[PDB]
Enzyme design. Sequence first.
Site, short mmCIF file in Angstrom:
data_model
loop_
_atom_site.label_atom_id
_atom_site.label_comp_id
_atom_site.label_asym_id
_atom_site.label_seq_id
_atom_site.Cartn_x
_atom_site.Cartn_y
_atom_site.Cartn_z
CB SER B 364 -0.77 -0.20 1.24
OG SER B 364 -1.86 1.27 1.38
NE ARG B 365 2.45 1.21 -6.11
CZ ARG B 365 2.30 1.40 -6.94
NH1 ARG B 365 2.67 2.34 -8.29
NH2 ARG B 365 1.80 0.06 -7.75
CB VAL B 366 -1.20 6.09 1.65
CG1 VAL B 366 -1.13 5.91 -0.24
CG2 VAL B 366 -2.42 5.21 2.24
#
Lengths: 62, 495, 53
Positions: B364-366
């Site tokens: 998950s790139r946050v």
Amino acid sequence: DPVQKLFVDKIREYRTKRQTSGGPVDAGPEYQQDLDRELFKLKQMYGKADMNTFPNFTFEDP
Amino acid sequence: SSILEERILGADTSVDLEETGRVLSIGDGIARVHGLRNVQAEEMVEFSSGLKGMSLNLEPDNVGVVVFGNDKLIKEGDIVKRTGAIVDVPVGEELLGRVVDALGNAIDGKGPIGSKARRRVGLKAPGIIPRISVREPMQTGIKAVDSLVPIGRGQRELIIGDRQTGKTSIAIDTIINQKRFNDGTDEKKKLYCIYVAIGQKRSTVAQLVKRLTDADAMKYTIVVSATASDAAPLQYLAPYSGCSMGEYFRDNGKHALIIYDDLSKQAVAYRQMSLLLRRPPGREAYPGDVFYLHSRLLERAAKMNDAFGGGSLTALPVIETQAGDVSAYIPTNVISITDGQIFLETELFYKGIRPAINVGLSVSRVGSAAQTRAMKQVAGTMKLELAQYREVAAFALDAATQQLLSRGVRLTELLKQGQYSPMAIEEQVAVIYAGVRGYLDKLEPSKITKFENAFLSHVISQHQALLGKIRTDGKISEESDAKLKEIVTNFLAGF
Amino acid sequence: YYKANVAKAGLVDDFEKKFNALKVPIPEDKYTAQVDAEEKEDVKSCAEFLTQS
Ligand SMILES: Nc1ncnc2c1ncn2[C@@H]1O[C@H](COP(=O)(O)OP(=O)(O)OP(=O)(O)O)[C@@H](O)[C@H]1O
Ligand SMILES: [Mg+2]
């Protein structure tokens, strides 16, 4: 509001329906058979209890 | 009875002067309409049979109109009336709890939709200034998703996996878990879920709506069903209708969640539409446009900054991969549009490890941003420990190696979960705490599940005060850590 | 409200009233005999074990 012929037409025809509804009008046997089948499935889903019998379970203990 | 007569009255019968065209040829789902001189592009025309169509091509001598129904209800010589508005759908809180089809026509019974506002399905995503970084957490209620691969509000995760690996189940658990927030006091934590069913069996959606109603989860959910039977131009349009019903909240300061399920069955409807329009097929017969189709749809899952209301619209596209080929065309088209991914292996699933998130590939790139601090404390350690366990699980020596194997197996057993059983954040924190700090290394792995259950029962029963303390102060203080430690030790004692 | 939803409303009121009349029989205890075990094992353990001790 009455000028539109169709509105008054539907109004009067439904009025006639209401008066003729002294009893329900134009059942047709198909009506009865449809009633039969749909009530049958309804009760079968519900059960074989009476229309309005207030039953009891007659509880017990372990 | 007379209620029906009243129903007669008040019906709009006033006639109007309206532009019109005549159908020339209907077949392959694209009608050719003659006339309609003043028809806008992407306008919504209406056929004489009550159908609707979108004015796709404005050719000099005719108009290509894609029909939003069964083209068997359209003759040649029919009459097409332009309704003078780009393709619109009804939006508002009047839809919550309603199963509307791809055009907002309630397929639910339960009367009509009392909407008072309309949006355009073909709107434009927010630019670069309105958006702000993802800050708030979207609680999925699933231990693996909430701990390892978290999600934020404004993020657009992807759920990708094979047939029957629990993608719809993750979606439904996410929808159900929002019930607690949607009852509290602050409107800032309420999430209004949406669920777009594209190319899915109608019976499946019926049972899904029944389940959501059992869990009291229809007070806020909207189901936009364009099922398998519905014509392709409806499966192609349903995601945009849903995204508009979500953009309404996003632009009115609220928070929405939209679940397209699947987006691999919209691209197939679009491929049908294109090939029937004779457009030049590309890779796998998909048109070259098949990217813009998803990019424009998923770029609306934004997170507006406080100067723009502050709302948000999370998106959870569901892609389905044949034979688990993550490198196919559509899977990569979408993997390069989204902010993360949850890979659902079909062999982890067949091992009973459900939900089957493949934590090796999921990301998950946050990520750490927009995660409850308590969960961060507990789950960073789990992420490192699982990493180490995976690094070595290719053979089954020393003390450290066996320790890694045992801790990893315990954690894997701990992350399993049951259907329709979301867990509050504090409960996940407590369980993963008891798992990672090492209060389970002696218990047999096979029992780790049972333990979990019993433990929850105790924790939710006696120490609700501690869990409330964790929830309110979203962090595990030292005293809270000590109380949790003694609770876990005491409970484990009784074994 | 339910009755308002029913056609045979009087039957609904009848059923509601009778329901109010019926009270589930309160089931009973039969196991103070476990209190008997309390006392018996009390005398047993106390006397024998605790005085032989
Ligand atoms: N967390 C879980 N625990 C146990 N069983 C699960 C879990 N998630 C899903 N399943 C089981 O998997 C089966 C199918 O799952 P599901 O329908 O969610 O997968 P799917 O990918 O949506 O399938 P499809 O996409 O083909 O509709 C269900 O019968 C369900 O019982
Ligand atoms: Mg499914």
